[PDB]
């Protein structure tokens, strides 16, 4: 019975559409023409549904899927109802363990291509030819929260890319900050337990603002550098598209001649760097906990493909010990002023998955999954990571055949003498299951190392030392990087860092813990220490006021690449404007607005006080995306209020608060005609004010002003005016 509407409006058009225009859908139905080798290789397991009979898992057609089998229609359910038990059994066993860390993540498919051959420095096949494309699957995530936690929390973000290369899978498993909190993997469980929900009551979710995290940080100064990044606006990115990606550790590139080059991996967001502000981010976890997941999926459906530039920081083997920090210390970043990021290639994410569980939830990424031409280093965090990502999927993905889960399968050949394990898919026909063997003539065979298509051979690094459980003495420096980071931020970023620490520490119940953290801040910078201390009602002591600042990092007093906003990098394509409608919209304003927005690739969401439709002054029927309360200003980048019958929304509480919220969160607001009367609500400026666009109508000049504001992301000059507005 229950069928599609007559008009076929149940199904989304299979073409790129702006966010909100059509219901979202599985990637292969939304963009059937978007292909790559990995996507095509998944065709063996994709299952359709249209025009097929409903069946059991054993292929038996079901006649009645509305009822259990029972003795009489008001009788007991019978044990022989195998249709019911199969259906319930499958339901009862739907869940699989979520990831210990990074449980909350959003993923997409894409492709990578190098700009030029990198054969002089590496024999890795995927970086050898500019016209050789490598399919990717990328998963972005948060760290602390469960798979059901919110997206816009303050946390580090994970940035994992699976490269399906012709010589094996390469997983580049990184983050959105260039360092990690700890130095040795042996302490991972301590750090993670400290930041995770506390053990007695399992609170708080997706928040570091609790006693145990700050206790750990206070006793483990090595965490301060990544804590600085977390407390900055880097901890609350606007989108996965507008954050940097870093592999954190120093790895090696190995060329065909055997030369090893130290490398640190970077991802540069081609959409620019952009973060939310704390109040916005926190409120957004409540208004839309799926904001980053939704934004990524819709960008891809709209053709606004998340694009990243892969970059390498290359350090010659002879320069290993030439910085004032150890290259193998993952709490230490390599300043771009010292070692520039060389551009390597572009990564484009152009298709969403079909089924989240099957492809995203089951995907297994592991930093040990390298290929010939790449190698590890002795970074002690990286070292311990190699043990963990293979181990963990034995329970998470049920066994050692996790490489056979469709999303994890290599697109290149794979043959070995490994057999069985739970849910073995591969049916091996090889007479032998061991080597050496004569019965299959020793196949599959080992392959000597070589310039191309060779077997993996580890770089023969000289190892010289006693068996010790000891931290390198060169890792024993914890304040210089934190301070380099602090001094590289703009004044408004520095305040946001202050506010982040002050907010977090205010949630720490034990006051001595707050004081210990403030003491640690005094070893980084007294201006910073004092600003936090004042917000906590703490007085720095005389000894604290006399702590000598840490040395500069190899002479650097700052490095602007560490700031999100010091150097403009603002792209408006893919951003969204909230348009506040009224019941007699001036169609001339609306036309100029959409044309201008369309030219720059900026989307629009038409909002009103109710759903359904509104008719403009020229009879144009405008479908309403959401109500003012339904899609808060949190969800958009700027707000436009066109002229029309302004008296319709002039006394609307939600319409007024929409502007106050956007204003508080430093977003550009544009008011046309009688819409300028909303200026009173945001008690500010008579003549005008930088950040607020105004004119008698919405024209070319009005829209160019707004788009220029959006290019700079937020109106930082308005900071001084926001802490009086009651919003």
Q: How far is the CB of 528 from a copy of itself (least distance, A)?
A: 16
With CB under 5 to 8 Å by kind, the binding choice for 287 among ligand HDD, a copy of itself, none is a copy of itself
Alpha helices in 163-223 (DSSP H): 188-195, 211-219
Cis peptide, bond prior to residue 204, ω within 30 of zero: yes
Question: How many beta carbons lie within 10 A of that of residue 84, not counting itself?
Answer: 17
Residues 227-256 that bind ligand HDD (CB under 6 A): 248
384 is a contact residue toward ligand HDD (CB under 6 A): yes
Stretch that binds a copy of itself, among 167-175, 364-372, 466-474, 484-492 (CB under 8 A): 466-474
726 is a contact residue toward a copy of itself (CB under 8 A): yes
SS3 of residue 217 by DSSP: helix
205 is a contact residue toward a copy of itself (CB under 8 A): yes
Q: Binder to ligand HDD among 126, 305, 325, 365 (CB under 6 A)?
A: 365
* Nearest to ligand HDD of 187, 523 (CB atom): 187
Stretch that binds a copy of itself, among 52-60, 460-468, 590-598, 640-648 (CB under 8 A): 460-468
Q: Binder to a copy of itself among 104, 109, 264, 603 (CB under 8 A)?
A: 104
Binding string, residues 341-370; x marks residues near a copy of itself by CB under 8 A: -----------xxxxxx--xx---------
* Nearest to a copy of itself of 33, 441 (CB atom): 33
Stretch that binds ligand HDD, among 382-390, 453-461, 569-577, 714-722 (CB under 6 A): 382-390
Stretch that binds a copy of itself, among 111-119, 178-186, 408-416, 708-716 (CB under 8 A): 178-186
Q: Binder to a copy of itself among 160, 538, 662, 666 (CB under 8 A)?
A: 538
Give me the residues paired with residue 141 across strands.
105, 158
Nearest to 170 by CA among 456, 461, 417, 450: 456
Residues 392-411 that bind ligand HDD (CB under 6 A): 392-393
Stretch that binds a copy of itself, among 49-57, 232-240, 444-452, 504-512 (CB under 8 A): 504-512
Cis peptide, bond prior to residue 436, ω within 30 of zero: yes
Q: Binder to a copy of itself among 16, 17, 35, 69 (CB under 8 A)?
A: 69
Stretch that binds ligand HDD, among 99-107, 266-274, 534-542, 709-717 (CB under 6 A): 99-107
Please report how the helices 211-219 and 188-195 are oriented relative to each other, as an axis angle in degrees rounded to 10: 140
* Nearest to ligand HDD of 385, 664 (CB atom): 385
171 is a contact residue toward a copy of itself (CB under 8 A): no
129 is a contact residue toward a copy of itself (CB under 8 A): no
With CB under 5 to 8 Å by kind, the binding choice for 722 among ligand HDD, a copy of itself, none is a copy of itself
SS3 of residue 389 by DSSP: helix
Question: How many beta carbons lie within 10 A of that of residue 179, not counting itself?
Answer: 26
SS3 of residue 252 by DSSP: strand
Query: Cα(112)–Cα(133) distance, rounded to whole angstroms?
Result: 6
Q: How far is the CB of 288 from a copy of itself (least distance, A)?
A: 8
Residues 140-199 that bind ligand HDD (CB under 6 A): 141, 158-160, 173-175, 180, 185, 188
- Burial of residue 672 (CB within 10 Å: 0-12, 13-18, 19+) is buried
88: part of which helix (H) or strand (E)?
A: helix 82-92
Task: Give, in order, the Cα–Cα distances in Å from 515 to each of 7, 204, 533, 549, 592.
Answer: 65, 21, 8, 19, 56
With CB under 5 to 8 Å by kind, the binding choice for 660 among ligand HDD, a copy of itself, none is a copy of itself
Query: Cα(716)–Cα(491) distance, rounded to whole angstroms?
Result: 10
Contact indicator for 327, 250 with CB cutoff of 8 Å: yes
Contact indicator for 114, 130 with CB cutoff of 8 Å: yes
Contact indicator for 569, 273 with CB cutoff of 8 Å: yes
287 is a contact residue toward a copy of itself (CB under 8 A): yes
- Burial of residue 388 (CB within 10 Å: 0-12, 13-18, 19+) is middle
Stretch that binds a copy of itself, among 43-51, 140-148, 238-246, 553-561 (CB under 8 A): 140-148
State the SS3 of 125-191.
HHHCCCCCCEEEEEEEECCCCCCCCCCCCCCCCEEEEEEEECCEEEEEEEECCCCCCCCCHHHHHHH
Six-digit token pair at 243? Answer: 């954050």
SS3 of residue 514 by DSSP: helix
With CB under 5 to 8 Å by kind, the binding choice for 326 among a copy of itself, ligand HDD, none is a copy of itself
Residues 663-722 that bind ligand HDD (CB under 6 A): none
Q: How far is the CB of 258 from a copy of itself (least distance, A)?
A: 19
State the SS3 of 282-309.
HHHHHHCCCHHHHHHHHHHHHCCCCEEE
Binding string, residues 299-338; x marks residues near ligand HDD by CB under 6 A: -------------------------------x--------
Contact indicator for 154, 207 with CB cutoff of 8 Å: yes
* Nearest to ligand HDD of 84, 719 (CB atom): 84
* Nearest to ligand HDD of 52, 201 (CB atom): 201
- Give the pairing type, strands 158-165 and 134-141: antiparallel
> Where does this chain bind ligand HDD (CB under 6 A)?
88, 92, 99-102, 105, 139, 141, 158-160, 173-175, 180, 185, 188, 248, 330, 363-365, 381, 384-385, 388-389, 392-393
């Amino acid at each position: 019975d229950s069928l599609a509407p007559e008009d076929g409006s149940h199904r989304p058009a299979a073409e790129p559409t702006p966010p909100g225009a059509q219901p979202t859908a599985p990637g292969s139905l939304k963009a059937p023409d978007t292909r790559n080798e990995k996507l095509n290789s998944l065709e063996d397991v994709r299952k359709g549904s249209e025009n097929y009979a409903l069946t059991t898992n054993q292929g038996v057609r079901i006649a009645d899927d509305q009822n259990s089998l029972r003795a009489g229609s008001r009788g007991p359910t019978l044990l022989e109802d195998f249709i019911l038990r199969e259906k319930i059994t499958h339901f009862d066993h739907e869940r699989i363990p979520e990831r210990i860390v990074h449980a909350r993540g959003s993923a997409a498919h894409g492709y990578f291509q190098p700009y030029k051959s990198l054969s002089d420095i590496t024999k890795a096949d995927f970086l050898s030819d500019p016209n050789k494309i490598t399919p990717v699957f990328v998963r972005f995530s948060t760290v602390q929260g469960g798979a059901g936690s919110a997206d816009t929390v303050r946390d580090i973000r994970g940035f994992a890319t699976k490269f399906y290369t012709e010589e094996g899978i390469f997983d580049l498993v990184g983050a959105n900050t260039p360092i990690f909190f700890i130095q040795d993997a042996h302490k991972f469980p301590d750090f993670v337990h400290a930041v995770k929900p506390e053990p007695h009551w399992a609170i708080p979710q997706g928040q570091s603002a609790h006693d145990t995290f700050w206790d750990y940080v206070s006793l483990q100064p090595e965490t301060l550098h990544n804590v600085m990044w977390a407390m900055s606006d880097r901890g609350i990115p606007r989108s996965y598209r507008t954050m940097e990606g870093f592999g954190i550790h120093t790895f090696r590139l190995i060329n065909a001649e055997g030369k090893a080059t130290f490398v640190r991996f970077h991802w540069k967001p081609l959409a620019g760097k952009a973060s939310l502000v704390w109040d916005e981010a926190q409120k957004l976890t409540g208004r839309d906990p799926d904001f980053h997941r939704r934004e990524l999926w819709e960008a891809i459906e709209a053709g606004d493909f998340p694009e990243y530039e892969l970059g390498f920081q290359l350090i010659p083997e002879e320069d290993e010990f030439k910085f004032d920090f150890d290259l193998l210390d993952p709490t230490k970043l390599i300043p771009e002023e010292l070692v520039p990021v060389q551009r390597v290639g572009k990564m484009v994410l152009n298709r969403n998955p079909d089924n989240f569980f099957a492809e995203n939830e089951q995907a297994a990424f592991h930093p040990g999954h390298i290929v010939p031409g790449l190698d590890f280093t002795n970074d002690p965090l990286l070292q311990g990571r190699l043990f963990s990502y293979t181990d963990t999927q034995i329970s998470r993905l049920g066994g050692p055949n996790f490489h056979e889960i469709p999303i994890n399968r290599p697109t290149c050949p794979y043959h070995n003498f490994q057999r069985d394990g739970m849910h073995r898919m591969g049916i091996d026909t090889n007479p032998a299951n061991y080597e050496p063997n004569s019965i299959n003539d020793n196949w599959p065979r080992e392959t000597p190392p070589g310039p191309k298509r060779g077997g993996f051979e580890s770089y023969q690094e000289r190892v010289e030392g006693n068996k010790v459980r000891e931290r390198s003495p060169s890792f024993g420096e914890y304040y210089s990087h934190p301070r380099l980071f602090w001094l590289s931020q703009t004044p408004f970023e520095q305040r946001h860092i202050v506010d982040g620490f002050s907010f977090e520490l205010s949630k720490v119940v034990r006051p001595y813990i707050r004081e210990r953290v403030v003491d640690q801040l005094a070893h980084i910078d007294l201006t910073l220490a004092q600003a936090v201390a004042k917000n906590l009602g703490i007085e720095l002591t005389d000894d604290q006021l006399n702590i000598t600042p840490p040395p500069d990092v190899n002479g650097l007093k700052k490095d602007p690449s560490l700031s999100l906003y010091a150097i403009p990098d603002g792209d408006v394509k893919g951003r969204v404007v909230a348009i506040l409608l009224n019941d007699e919209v001036r169609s001339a304003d609306l036309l100029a607005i959409l044309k201008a927005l369309k030219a720059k690739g900026v989307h629009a969401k038409l909002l009103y006080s109710r759903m359904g439709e509104v008719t403009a002054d020229d009879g144009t029927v405008l479908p309403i995306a959401a109500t003012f309360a339904g899609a808060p200003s949190l969800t958009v980048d700027a707000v436009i209020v066109p002229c029309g019958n302004i008296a319709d929304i002039a006394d609307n509480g939600d319409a007024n608060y929409y502007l106050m919220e956007a204003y508080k969160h430093l977003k550009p607001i544009a008011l046309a005609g009688d819409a300028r009367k909303f200026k009173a609500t945001i008690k500010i400026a008579d003549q005008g004010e930088e950040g607020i666009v105004e004119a008698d109508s919405a024209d070319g000049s009005f829209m160019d002003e707004l788009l220029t504001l959006m290019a700079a992301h937020r109106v930082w000059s308005r900071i001084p005016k926001i802490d009086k507005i009651p919003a």
